[PDB]
Amino acid sequence: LSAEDKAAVERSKMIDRNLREDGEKAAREVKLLLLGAGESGKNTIVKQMKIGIVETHFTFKDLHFKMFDVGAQRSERKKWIHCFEGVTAIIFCVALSDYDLVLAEDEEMNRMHASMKLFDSICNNKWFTDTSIILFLNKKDLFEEKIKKSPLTICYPEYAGSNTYEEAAAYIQCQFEDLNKRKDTKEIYTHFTCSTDTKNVQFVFDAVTDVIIKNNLKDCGLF
Amino acid sequence: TASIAQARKLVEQLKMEANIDRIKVSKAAADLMAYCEAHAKEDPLLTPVPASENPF
Amino acid sequence: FRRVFLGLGMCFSYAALLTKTNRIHRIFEQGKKSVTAPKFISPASQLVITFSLISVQLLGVFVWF
Amino acid sequence: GSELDQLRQEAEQLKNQIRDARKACADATLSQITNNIDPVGRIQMRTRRTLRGHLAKIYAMHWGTDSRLLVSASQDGKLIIWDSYTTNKVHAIPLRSSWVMTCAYAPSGNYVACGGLDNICSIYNLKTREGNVRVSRELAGHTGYLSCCRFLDDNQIVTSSGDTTCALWDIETGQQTTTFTGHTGDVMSLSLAPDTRLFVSGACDASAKLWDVREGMCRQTFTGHESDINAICFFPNGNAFATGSDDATCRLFDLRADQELMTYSHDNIICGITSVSFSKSGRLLLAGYDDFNCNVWDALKADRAGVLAGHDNRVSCLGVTDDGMAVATGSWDSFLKIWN
């Protein structure tokens, strides 16, 4: 082996060392996929987490998150959805103050029905069979102020319940957690977000920590 | 307005497509069935190469 | 047989207990700090650790003999 | 209203003229002419090199002109240049996006391009006086994810996007000289002609199109599939190309008789095709599938000629090299394998 070849092997070993260090660094970060409707309050939640694709790094209690967002990607989701098979969790927003509205100029489509359809598609996808979901049900104050004048019968014909923030919110929540047909592999963490909530980072921290511990226990065959 | 413009654009595109000089399929098949015979001996994926050259 | 087997059962039981409790502690402690699973949490590695701790007593008994 | 119907009716009339003119050209089938041809023997290739170092899914690769140097793009945020002869690593380039889908190696060898899920095609300079690989230009203008890019020269590039359009760029000024429109569905791949005069593209509308590099016009459109087209490549002559789809089939199209010639299919495969490349003679057609395998077909007879099985996940990219020696596969299992 010539001296030049020895120099080449030296350089290759340096490159391998650098790549190993970078991979070990990248393996310890939480990767989140932020999904939701355009007007579902994604921007406010993004703002209160951090104190084509848009990336937002943020740290909480000595742990790191990257939090990818794909809202501005108007194309077929089946083509690029498999790029997110190995993410830690999926965050999904609903915007409860949408049960008496219409979208996409269809003029016969409840916004919340479209949200349920999207949730059903994402939850029962082939690439996401063991990925937990954090469901934020936000704009609850508008729901509280609105529920008096308009009942839930516009969005749900069968309600058999009272018009109060105590029972309608729970009714909407039990609708979304009943579309999950994989109850023995994943779970849904539901939280009610609002303006100046300031307590959503900790909820995400708790959910992701539980997810990590459960994954590690399942790998050991200990769960 | 946009729909009629799209329709006219498709009409022009189809009329440009439908005026090609198309040869019959036997000629194309013979033309491509003869390329391999001309370049068979220089392709080592189907004919193995002796271990002398074999960069790998 | 008396010399070898007198303290072997207690060693077995308590080495196994120590290894399993350590596994649970490490999992639930590093679960709050990194995504990556802690190293050596698997039946093979745990058995290796347990039988190394037993091998200590076995070698001591050998020196005694 | 009425003239909308008139335009539609003219459209079906033009389609009918196209189809019966096509049927007036089919003397026989490729199987009829190639009925009596010396069968290709069984190909038994074995892996010779194994390139390790990537830590995530690999999404694209491209061979160099010299047939030694290689480029690989992974979702780990890395673009790696390999010396295949010695397995050595020549350059490691960090990526700003890490959501790459495509990469390319320039004919001159001084430039490398990459792109994906950022609507930007990035160009890197390999030969610099400072001794490091730097960004030369960031091409922007697409409104959808990049799917494939190819170099024409040092100063000309072509890109395809998920916004259903293609583009030609001059790199000194970084502007779109020509835009190619059509393809009502998402574009997935493109292939350049050997004379760099035309190029073909495949889309999610289950159709392919042939474009002229100058004049920005579409000349021929080809149909025949039941689902999305994922890969495309030219036959070495330059008078035909091949496409692979999600309907678990491959097909071959000629240009002078603008219709389908042959379809490669079986009953044991139900998964789609991710990549397609030709050999130097054109007698062999290589295709990577979703069942972790690579299948080698005989183009003139359409029979299974070989299977390559050494991968633990989906095979995503192929390359055949300019002098015909080695084939390279890149897969989701983070490894590149070279076969001969």
Side-chain angles (χ1 to χ4, degrees), chain A residues 44-73 75-84:
Chain A
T44 60
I45 292 172
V46 160
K47 187 259 292 180
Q48 54 98 14
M49 294 298 102
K50 181 254 289 180
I51 58 170
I53 286 189
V54 171
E55 182 166 0
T56 304
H57 305 178
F58 72 96
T59 66
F60 204 64
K61 293 187 286 185
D62 292 331
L63 188 153
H64 301 264
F65 313 76
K66 277 193 282 185
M67 184 177 177
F68 315 106
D69 186 74
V70 294
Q73 186 75 46
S75 64
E76 292 293 328
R77 203 174 34 242
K78 296 183 290 294
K79 299 287 97 176
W80 54 260
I81 200 56
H82 45 69
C83 305
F84 296 90

mmCIF file of all heavy atoms in Angstrom, chain A residues 44-84, unseen atoms left out:
data_model
loop_
_atom_site.group_PDB
_atom_site.id
_atom_site.type_symbol
_atom_site.label_atom_id
_atom_site.label_comp_id
_atom_site.label_asym_id
_atom_site.label_seq_id
_atom_site.Cartn_x
_atom_site.Cartn_y
_atom_site.Cartn_z
ATOM 1 N N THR A 44 -50.541 29.457 17.273
ATOM 2 C CA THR A 44 -50.442 29.819 18.684
ATOM 3 C C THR A 44 -49.715 28.740 19.477
ATOM 4 O O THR A 44 -48.877 29.042 20.338
ATOM 5 C CB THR A 44 -51.835 30.067 19.264
ATOM 6 O OG1 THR A 44 -52.624 28.878 19.140
ATOM 7 C CG2 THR A 44 -52.523 31.207 18.528
ATOM 8 N N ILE A 45 -50.026 27.473 19.200
ATOM 9 C CA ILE A 45 -49.364 26.371 19.890
ATOM 10 C C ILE A 45 -47.880 26.350 19.552
ATOM 11 O O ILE A 45 -47.034 26.104 20.419
ATOM 12 C CB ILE A 45 -50.052 25.036 19.548
ATOM 13 C CG1 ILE A 45 -51.453 24.999 20.161
ATOM 14 C CG2 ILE A 45 -49.227 23.859 20.042
ATOM 15 C CD1 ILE A 45 -52.283 23.820 19.723
ATOM 16 N N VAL A 46 -47.541 26.622 18.289
ATOM 17 C CA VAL A 46 -46.136 26.724 17.898
ATOM 18 C C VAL A 46 -45.451 27.835 18.679
ATOM 19 O O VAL A 46 -44.316 27.678 19.151
ATOM 20 C CB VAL A 46 -46.022 26.950 16.379
ATOM 21 C CG1 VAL A 46 -44.666 27.543 16.024
ATOM 22 C CG2 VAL A 46 -46.245 25.656 15.631
ATOM 23 N N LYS A 47 -46.128 28.974 18.829
ATOM 24 C CA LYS A 47 -45.550 30.098 19.558
ATOM 25 C C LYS A 47 -45.309 29.746 21.022
ATOM 26 O O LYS A 47 -44.278 30.120 21.593
ATOM 27 C CB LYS A 47 -46.460 31.321 19.439
ATOM 28 C CG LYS A 47 -45.875 32.603 20.015
ATOM 29 C CD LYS A 47 -46.447 32.914 21.390
ATOM 30 C CE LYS A 47 -47.916 33.292 21.305
ATOM 31 N NZ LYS A 47 -48.490 33.591 22.646
ATOM 32 N N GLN A 48 -46.244 29.036 21.648
ATOM 33 C CA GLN A 48 -46.105 28.734 23.068
ATOM 34 C C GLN A 48 -45.316 27.457 23.352
ATOM 35 O O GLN A 48 -45.044 27.170 24.523
ATOM 36 C CB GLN A 48 -47.483 28.683 23.746
ATOM 37 C CG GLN A 48 -48.508 27.760 23.118
ATOM 38 C CD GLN A 48 -48.606 26.422 23.811
ATOM 39 O OE1 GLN A 48 -48.098 26.243 24.918
ATOM 40 N NE2 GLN A 48 -49.289 25.477 23.175
ATOM 41 N N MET A 49 -44.944 26.684 22.327
ATOM 42 C CA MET A 49 -43.922 25.653 22.513
ATOM 43 C C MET A 49 -42.534 26.265 22.669
ATOM 44 O O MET A 49 -41.777 25.888 23.570
ATOM 45 C CB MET A 49 -43.931 24.659 21.349
ATOM 46 C CG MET A 49 -45.172 23.797 21.214
ATOM 47 S SD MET A 49 -45.418 22.736 22.653
ATOM 48 C CE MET A 49 -46.706 23.603 23.533
ATOM 49 N N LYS A 50 -42.183 27.210 21.801
ATOM 50 C CA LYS A 50 -40.842 27.784 21.768
ATOM 51 C C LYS A 50 -40.865 29.128 22.484
ATOM 52 O O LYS A 50 -41.445 30.097 21.984
ATOM 53 C CB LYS A 50 -40.351 27.930 20.329
ATOM 54 C CG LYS A 50 -38.948 28.502 20.204
ATOM 55 C CD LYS A 50 -38.974 29.940 19.712
ATOM 56 C CE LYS A 50 -39.387 30.012 18.251
ATOM 57 N NZ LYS A 50 -39.417 31.413 17.749
ATOM 58 N N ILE A 51 -40.230 29.185 23.650
ATOM 59 C CA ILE A 51 -40.178 30.411 24.436
ATOM 60 C C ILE A 51 -38.730 30.831 24.664
ATOM 61 O O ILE A 51 -37.803 30.192 24.169
ATOM 62 C CB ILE A 51 -40.917 30.247 25.775
ATOM 63 C CG1 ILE A 51 -40.309 29.099 26.585
ATOM 64 C CG2 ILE A 51 -42.402 30.012 25.540
ATOM 65 C CD1 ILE A 51 -40.823 29.016 28.005
ATOM 66 N N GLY A 52 -41.855 25.064 2.214
ATOM 67 C CA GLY A 52 -41.897 23.656 2.563
ATOM 68 C C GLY A 52 -42.055 23.403 4.050
ATOM 69 O O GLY A 52 -42.924 23.984 4.701
ATOM 70 N N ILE A 53 -41.209 22.533 4.588
ATOM 71 C CA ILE A 53 -41.264 22.169 5.998
ATOM 72 C C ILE A 53 -40.635 23.277 6.831
ATOM 73 O O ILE A 53 -39.618 23.863 6.448
ATOM 74 C CB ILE A 53 -40.560 20.820 6.227
ATOM 75 C CG1 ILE A 53 -41.419 19.675 5.704
ATOM 76 C CG2 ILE A 53 -40.266 20.593 7.698
ATOM 77 C CD1 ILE A 53 -40.893 18.309 6.073
ATOM 78 N N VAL A 54 -41.250 23.574 7.973
ATOM 79 C CA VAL A 54 -40.721 24.521 8.946
ATOM 80 C C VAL A 54 -40.320 23.745 10.192
ATOM 81 O O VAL A 54 -41.108 22.947 10.713
ATOM 82 C CB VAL A 54 -41.747 25.617 9.278
ATOM 83 C CG1 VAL A 54 -41.265 26.465 10.439
ATOM 84 C CG2 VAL A 54 -42.001 26.479 8.061
ATOM 85 N N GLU A 55 -39.099 23.975 10.666
ATOM 86 C CA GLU A 55 -38.526 23.250 11.790
ATOM 87 C C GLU A 55 -38.317 24.196 12.966
ATOM 88 O O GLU A 55 -37.898 25.341 12.782
ATOM 89 C CB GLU A 55 -37.203 22.599 11.388
ATOM 90 C CG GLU A 55 -36.547 21.769 12.471
ATOM 91 C CD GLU A 55 -35.437 20.892 11.930
ATOM 92 O OE1 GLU A 55 -35.178 20.944 10.710
ATOM 93 O OE2 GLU A 55 -34.822 20.151 12.725
ATOM 94 N N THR A 56 -38.610 23.714 14.178
ATOM 95 C CA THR A 56 -38.566 24.549 15.381
ATOM 96 C C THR A 56 -37.955 23.756 16.534
ATOM 97 O O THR A 56 -38.650 22.982 17.198
ATOM 98 C CB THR A 56 -39.959 25.048 15.745
ATOM 99 O OG1 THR A 56 -40.525 25.745 14.630
ATOM 100 C CG2 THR A 56 -39.894 25.988 16.938
ATOM 101 N N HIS A 57 -36.668 23.974 16.790
ATOM 102 C CA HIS A 57 -35.987 23.322 17.900
ATOM 103 C C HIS A 57 -36.326 24.006 19.217
ATOM 104 O O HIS A 57 -36.344 25.236 19.305
ATOM 105 C CB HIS A 57 -34.472 23.352 17.692
ATOM 106 C CG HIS A 57 -34.020 22.768 16.390
ATOM 107 N ND1 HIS A 57 -32.696 22.750 16.007
ATOM 108 C CD2 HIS A 57 -34.707 22.168 15.390
ATOM 109 C CE1 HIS A 57 -32.590 22.173 14.824
ATOM 110 N NE2 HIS A 57 -33.796 21.811 14.428
ATOM 111 N N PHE A 58 -36.590 23.206 20.252
ATOM 112 C CA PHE A 58 -36.802 23.773 21.578
ATOM 113 C C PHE A 58 -36.484 22.735 22.644
ATOM 114 O O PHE A 58 -36.612 21.530 22.420
ATOM 115 C CB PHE A 58 -38.232 24.307 21.749
ATOM 116 C CG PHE A 58 -39.283 23.237 21.847
ATOM 117 C CD1 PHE A 58 -39.726 22.795 23.079
ATOM 118 C CD2 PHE A 58 -39.844 22.691 20.708
ATOM 119 C CE1 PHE A 58 -40.690 21.824 23.175
ATOM 120 C CE2 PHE A 58 -40.813 21.718 20.800
ATOM 121 C CZ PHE A 58 -41.237 21.284 22.036
ATOM 122 N N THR A 59 -36.078 23.216 23.817
ATOM 123 C CA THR A 59 -35.615 22.362 24.901
ATOM 124 C C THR A 59 -36.473 22.561 26.141
ATOM 125 O O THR A 59 -36.871 23.685 26.460
ATOM 126 C CB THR A 59 -34.152 22.647 25.251
ATOM 127 O OG1 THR A 59 -34.038 23.969 25.793
ATOM 128 C CG2 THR A 59 -33.278 22.540 24.017
ATOM 129 N N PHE A 60 -36.751 21.462 26.836
ATOM 130 C CA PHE A 60 -37.451 21.500 28.112
ATOM 131 C C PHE A 60 -36.804 20.510 29.067
ATOM 132 O O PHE A 60 -36.603 19.345 28.713
ATOM 133 C CB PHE A 60 -38.941 21.182 27.948
ATOM 134 C CG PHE A 60 -39.801 21.745 29.041
ATOM 135 C CD1 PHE A 60 -39.913 23.111 29.213
ATOM 136 C CD2 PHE A 60 -40.486 20.913 29.899
ATOM 137 C CE1 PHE A 60 -40.697 23.632 30.217
ATOM 138 C CE2 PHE A 60 -41.271 21.429 30.902
ATOM 139 C CZ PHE A 60 -41.375 22.790 31.063
ATOM 140 N N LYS A 61 -36.474 20.992 30.263
ATOM 141 C CA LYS A 61 -35.893 20.204 31.350
ATOM 142 C C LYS A 61 -34.844 19.215 30.844
ATOM 143 O O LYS A 61 -34.956 18.001 31.006
ATOM 144 C CB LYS A 61 -36.979 19.494 32.154
ATOM 145 C CG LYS A 61 -37.876 20.439 32.927
ATOM 146 C CD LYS A 61 -38.833 19.690 33.843
ATOM 147 C CE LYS A 61 -39.946 19.020 33.071
ATOM 148 N NZ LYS A 61 -40.938 18.383 33.979
ATOM 149 N N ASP A 62 -33.808 19.774 30.224
ATOM 150 C CA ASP A 62 -32.663 19.006 29.735
ATOM 151 C C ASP A 62 -33.071 17.935 28.728
ATOM 152 O O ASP A 62 -32.535 16.826 28.739
ATOM 153 C CB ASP A 62 -31.885 18.376 30.894
ATOM 154 C CG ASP A 62 -31.180 19.408 31.753
ATOM 155 O OD1 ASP A 62 -30.813 20.476 31.219
ATOM 156 O OD2 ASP A 62 -30.996 19.152 32.961
ATOM 157 N N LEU A 63 -34.019 18.248 27.850
ATOM 158 C CA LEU A 63 -34.386 17.342 26.775
ATOM 159 C C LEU A 63 -34.715 18.182 25.547
ATOM 160 O O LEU A 63 -35.193 19.311 25.667
ATOM 161 C CB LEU A 63 -35.561 16.448 27.200
ATOM 162 C CG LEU A 63 -36.027 15.283 26.326
ATOM 163 C CD1 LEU A 63 -36.678 14.239 27.195
ATOM 164 C CD2 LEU A 63 -36.977 15.724 25.249
ATOM 165 N N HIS A 64 -34.459 17.627 24.364
ATOM 166 C CA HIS A 64 -34.507 18.375 23.115
ATOM 167 C C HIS A 64 -35.647 17.898 22.222
ATOM 168 O O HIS A 64 -35.982 16.711 22.198
ATOM 169 C CB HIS A 64 -33.183 18.240 22.360
ATOM 170 C CG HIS A 64 -31.994 18.723 23.129
ATOM 171 N ND1 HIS A 64 -31.470 19.987 22.977
ATOM 172 C CD2 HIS A 64 -31.222 18.105 24.054
ATOM 173 C CE1 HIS A 64 -30.430 20.131 23.777
ATOM 174 N NE2 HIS A 64 -30.257 19.003 24.441
ATOM 175 N N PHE A 65 -36.239 18.837 21.478
ATOM 176 C CA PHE A 65 -37.299 18.549 20.521
ATOM 177 C C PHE A 65 -37.039 19.324 19.235
ATOM 178 O O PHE A 65 -36.468 20.418 19.258
ATOM 179 C CB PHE A 65 -38.695 18.939 21.035
ATOM 180 C CG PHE A 65 -39.007 18.491 22.440
ATOM 181 C CD1 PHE A 65 -38.465 19.136 23.536
ATOM 182 C CD2 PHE A 65 -39.904 17.464 22.662
ATOM 183 C CE1 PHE A 65 -38.777 18.734 24.816
ATOM 184 C CE2 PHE A 65 -40.222 17.065 23.942
ATOM 185 C CZ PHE A 65 -39.661 17.702 25.017
ATOM 186 N N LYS A 66 -37.509 18.768 18.115
ATOM 187 C CA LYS A 66 -37.343 19.374 16.796
ATOM 188 C C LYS A 66 -38.641 19.847 16.150
ATOM 189 O O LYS A 66 -38.641 20.893 15.499
ATOM 190 C CB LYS A 66 -36.629 18.402 15.853
ATOM 191 C CG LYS A 66 -35.115 18.427 15.994
ATOM 192 C CD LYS A 66 -34.435 17.709 14.847
ATOM 193 C CE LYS A 66 -34.500 16.202 15.019
ATOM 194 N NZ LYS A 66 -33.730 15.487 13.963
ATOM 195 N N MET A 67 -39.740 19.100 16.278
ATOM 196 C CA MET A 67 -41.096 19.597 16.007
ATOM 197 C C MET A 67 -41.255 20.096 14.563
ATOM 198 O O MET A 67 -41.321 21.294 14.284
ATOM 199 C CB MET A 67 -41.485 20.682 17.019
ATOM 200 C CG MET A 67 -42.911 21.194 16.872
ATOM 201 S SD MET A 67 -43.357 22.399 18.133
ATOM 202 C CE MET A 67 -45.005 22.845 17.601
ATOM 203 N N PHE A 68 -41.262 19.139 13.640
ATOM 204 C CA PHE A 68 -41.496 19.438 12.231
ATOM 205 C C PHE A 68 -42.957 19.783 11.951
ATOM 206 O O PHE A 68 -43.874 19.313 12.627
ATOM 207 C CB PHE A 68 -41.078 18.252 11.368
ATOM 208 C CG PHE A 68 -39.757 17.675 11.750
ATOM 209 C CD1 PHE A 68 -39.683 16.466 12.412
ATOM 210 C CD2 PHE A 68 -38.589 18.351 11.467
ATOM 211 C CE1 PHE A 68 -38.471 15.938 12.772
ATOM 212 C CE2 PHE A 68 -37.372 17.827 11.826
ATOM 213 C CZ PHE A 68 -37.311 16.617 12.479
ATOM 214 N N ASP A 69 -43.160 20.610 10.925
ATOM 215 C CA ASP A 69 -44.474 21.083 10.504
ATOM 216 C C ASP A 69 -44.583 21.016 8.987
ATOM 217 O O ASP A 69 -43.680 21.459 8.271
ATOM 218 C CB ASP A 69 -44.716 22.513 10.977
ATOM 219 C CG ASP A 69 -46.113 22.994 10.681
ATOM 220 O OD1 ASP A 69 -47.055 22.555 11.374
ATOM 221 O OD2 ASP A 69 -46.272 23.818 9.760
ATOM 222 N N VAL A 70 -45.695 20.469 8.499
ATOM 223 C CA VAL A 70 -45.876 20.218 7.073
ATOM 224 C C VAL A 70 -47.172 20.843 6.577
ATOM 225 O O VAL A 70 -47.781 20.354 5.620
ATOM 226 C CB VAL A 70 -45.857 18.709 6.773
ATOM 227 C CG1 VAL A 70 -44.486 18.127 7.056
ATOM 228 C CG2 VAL A 70 -46.908 18.000 7.602
ATOM 229 N N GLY A 71 -47.603 21.929 7.220
ATOM 230 C CA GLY A 71 -48.867 22.542 6.845
ATOM 231 C C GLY A 71 -48.871 23.080 5.427
ATOM 232 O O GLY A 71 -49.843 22.903 4.689
ATOM 233 N N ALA A 72 -47.790 23.743 5.025
ATOM 234 C CA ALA A 72 -47.706 24.357 3.701
ATOM 235 C C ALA A 72 -47.158 23.412 2.640
ATOM 236 O O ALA A 72 -46.211 23.753 1.927
ATOM 237 C CB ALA A 72 -46.861 25.624 3.787
ATOM 238 N N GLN A 73 -47.737 22.218 2.512
ATOM 239 C CA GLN A 73 -47.303 21.219 1.541
ATOM 240 C C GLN A 73 -48.541 20.706 0.801
ATOM 241 O O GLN A 73 -49.144 19.703 1.185
ATOM 242 C CB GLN A 73 -46.544 20.086 2.229
ATOM 243 C CG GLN A 73 -45.930 19.069 1.285
ATOM 244 C CD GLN A 73 -44.690 19.593 0.592
ATOM 245 O OE1 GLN A 73 -43.813 20.177 1.225
ATOM 246 N NE2 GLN A 73 -44.614 19.391 -0.716
ATOM 247 N N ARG A 74 -48.919 21.403 -0.267
ATOM 248 C CA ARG A 74 -50.117 21.049 -1.021
ATOM 249 C C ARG A 74 -49.767 20.015 -2.084
ATOM 250 O O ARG A 74 -49.413 20.368 -3.214
ATOM 251 C CB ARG A 74 -50.731 22.295 -1.651
ATOM 252 N N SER A 75 -49.873 18.737 -1.724
ATOM 253 C CA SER A 75 -49.595 17.636 -2.637
ATOM 254 C C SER A 75 -50.139 16.340 -2.052
ATOM 255 O O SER A 75 -50.814 16.360 -1.018
ATOM 256 C CB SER A 75 -48.094 17.517 -2.910
ATOM 257 O OG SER A 75 -47.381 17.200 -1.731
ATOM 258 N N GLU A 76 -49.860 15.212 -2.700
ATOM 259 C CA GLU A 76 -50.347 13.925 -2.220
ATOM 260 C C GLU A 76 -49.560 13.508 -0.986
ATOM 261 O O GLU A 76 -48.335 13.369 -1.038
ATOM 262 C CB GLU A 76 -50.240 12.865 -3.313
ATOM 263 C CG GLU A 76 -51.186 13.084 -4.477
ATOM 264 C CD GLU A 76 -52.640 12.910 -4.089
ATOM 265 O OE1 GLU A 76 -52.924 12.083 -3.197
ATOM 266 O OE2 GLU A 76 -53.500 13.602 -4.673
ATOM 267 N N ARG A 77 -50.271 13.303 0.124
ATOM 268 C CA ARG A 77 -49.625 12.913 1.368
ATOM 269 C C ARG A 77 -49.092 11.489 1.325
ATOM 270 O O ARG A 77 -48.150 11.171 2.059
ATOM 271 C CB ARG A 77 -50.603 13.071 2.531
ATOM 272 C CG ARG A 77 -49.939 13.241 3.881
ATOM 273 C CD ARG A 77 -50.956 13.531 4.969
ATOM 274 N NE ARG A 77 -52.222 12.847 4.736
ATOM 275 C CZ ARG A 77 -53.380 13.465 4.549
ATOM 276 N NH1 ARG A 77 -53.470 14.784 4.570
ATOM 277 N NH2 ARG A 77 -54.475 12.741 4.337
ATOM 278 N N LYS A 78 -49.668 10.628 0.485
ATOM 279 C CA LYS A 78 -49.202 9.251 0.382
ATOM 280 C C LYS A 78 -47.781 9.158 -0.153
ATOM 281 O O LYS A 78 -47.105 8.154 0.090
ATOM 282 C CB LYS A 78 -50.137 8.444 -0.518
ATOM 283 C CG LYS A 78 -51.548 8.303 0.016
ATOM 284 C CD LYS A 78 -52.396 7.434 -0.895
ATOM 285 C CE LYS A 78 -52.701 8.142 -2.205
ATOM 286 N NZ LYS A 78 -53.568 9.336 -2.002
ATOM 287 N N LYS A 79 -47.316 10.174 -0.878
ATOM 288 C CA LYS A 79 -45.992 10.108 -1.481
ATOM 289 C C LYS A 79 -44.882 10.371 -0.468
ATOM 290 O O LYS A 79 -43.813 9.755 -0.551
ATOM 291 C CB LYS A 79 -45.904 11.092 -2.644
ATOM 292 C CG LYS A 79 -46.897 10.840 -3.777
ATOM 293 C CD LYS A 79 -46.539 9.616 -4.617
ATOM 294 C CE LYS A 79 -47.296 8.369 -4.193
ATOM 295 N NZ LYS A 79 -47.005 7.224 -5.097
ATOM 296 N N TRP A 80 -45.104 11.271 0.491
ATOM 297 C CA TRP A 80 -44.052 11.657 1.425
ATOM 298 C C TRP A 80 -44.374 11.335 2.879
ATOM 299 O O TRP A 80 -43.587 11.691 3.763
ATOM 300 C CB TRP A 80 -43.725 13.151 1.286
ATOM 301 C CG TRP A 80 -44.897 14.081 1.404
ATOM 302 C CD1 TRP A 80 -45.577 14.668 0.382
ATOM 303 C CD2 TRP A 80 -45.509 14.551 2.612
ATOM 304 N NE1 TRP A 80 -46.579 15.463 0.874
ATOM 305 C CE2 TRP A 80 -46.559 15.408 2.241
ATOM 306 C CE3 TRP A 80 -45.275 14.323 3.970
ATOM 307 C CZ2 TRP A 80 -47.372 16.036 3.175
ATOM 308 C CZ3 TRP A 80 -46.084 14.948 4.894
ATOM 309 C CH2 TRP A 80 -47.120 15.791 4.494
ATOM 310 N N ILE A 81 -45.495 10.667 3.159
ATOM 311 C CA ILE A 81 -45.863 10.423 4.550
ATOM 312 C C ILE A 81 -44.938 9.399 5.202
ATOM 313 O O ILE A 81 -44.723 9.441 6.419
ATOM 314 C CB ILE A 81 -47.343 10.004 4.642
ATOM 315 C CG1 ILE A 81 -47.878 10.223 6.058
ATOM 316 C CG2 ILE A 81 -47.535 8.558 4.211
ATOM 317 C CD1 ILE A 81 -47.730 11.638 6.553
ATOM 318 N N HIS A 82 -44.374 8.473 4.425
ATOM 319 C CA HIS A 82 -43.526 7.436 5.000
ATOM 320 C C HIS A 82 -42.188 7.968 5.491
ATOM 321 O O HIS A 82 -41.470 7.238 6.180
ATOM 322 C CB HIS A 82 -43.292 6.313 3.990
ATOM 323 C CG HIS A 82 -42.962 6.792 2.611
ATOM 324 N ND1 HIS A 82 -41.779 7.424 2.306
ATOM 325 C CD2 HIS A 82 -43.658 6.717 1.452
ATOM 326 C CE1 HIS A 82 -41.762 7.726 1.020
ATOM 327 N NE2 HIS A 82 -42.891 7.307 0.480
ATOM 328 N N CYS A 83 -41.837 9.211 5.160
ATOM 329 C CA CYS A 83 -40.628 9.822 5.693
ATOM 330 C C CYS A 83 -40.710 10.067 7.194
ATOM 331 O O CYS A 83 -39.680 10.349 7.814
ATOM 332 C CB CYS A 83 -40.349 11.142 4.976
ATOM 333 S SG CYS A 83 -40.251 11.026 3.181
ATOM 334 N N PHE A 84 -41.898 9.968 7.785
ATOM 335 C CA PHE A 84 -42.115 10.249 9.199
ATOM 336 C C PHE A 84 -42.526 8.994 9.960
ATOM 337 O O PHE A 84 -43.237 9.073 10.961
ATOM 338 C CB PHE A 84 -43.170 11.338 9.376
ATOM 339 C CG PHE A 84 -42.773 12.668 8.812
ATOM 340 C CD1 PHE A 84 -43.072 12.995 7.505
ATOM 341 C CD2 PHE A 84 -42.120 13.598 9.593
ATOM 342 C CE1 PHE A 84 -42.716 14.220 6.989
ATOM 343 C CE2 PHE A 84 -41.763 14.821 9.079
ATOM 344 C CZ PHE A 84 -42.061 15.130 7.775
#
